[PDB]
Amino acid sequence: GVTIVKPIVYGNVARYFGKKREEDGHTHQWTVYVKPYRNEDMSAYVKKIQFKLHESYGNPLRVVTKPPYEITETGWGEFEIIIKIFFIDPNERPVTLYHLLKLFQKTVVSEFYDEMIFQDPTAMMQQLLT
Numbered sequence: 001g002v003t004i005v006k007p008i009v010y011g012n013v014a015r016y017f018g019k020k021r022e023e024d025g026h027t028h029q030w031t032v033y034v035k036p037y038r039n040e041d042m043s044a045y046v047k048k049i050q051f052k053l054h055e056s057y058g059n060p061l062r063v064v065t066k067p068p069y070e071i072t073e074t075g076w077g078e079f080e081i082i083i084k085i086f087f088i089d090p091n092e093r094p095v096t097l098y099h100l101l102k103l104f105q106k107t108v109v110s111e112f113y114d115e116m117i118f119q120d121p122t123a124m125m126q127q128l129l130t
């Protein structure tokens with residue numbers, strides 16, 4: 001058969017404001033992201049990437065259809081974000097990733113390697129993947 005592996009990295013970077021913002025008490029900017037391990041445009045084969053935030057964010061289900069696949073925000077607390085990658089091929093199962101936002105103990109980075117495996121995809125999707 002044919003196996004196409006698309007290595008990815010996902011997670012988040014964060015920077016402390018310097019002080020706490022008295023307006024809303026946010027302390028950090030963060031960017032949560034998926035990206036290919038090596039430089040490529042994933043919109044070749046990816047329809048969209050949802051980033052599900054804590055539901056006390058406005059518009060908690062964020063959608064990104066064009067690289068970079070990232071959401072930038074501010075806050076004061078760490079919680080799980082769900083990252084769901086949908087493919088242009090409707091017969092390819094979405095990939096669900098789970099990421100604990102890291103804010104605390106210099107840029108803070110929490111990023112994970114993973115691999116989207118396409119086992120025997122349609123020739124058409126194979127064309128999109130390569």
Ligand SMILES: CC(=O)Nc1ccc2c(c1)CCCC2=O
Nearest residue numbers: 054056057058074075076077079
């Ligand atoms: C509207 C708004 O700013 N919501 C918001 C902001 C920050 C945070 C949360 C929600 C909940 C999780 C922790 C956190 O840092």
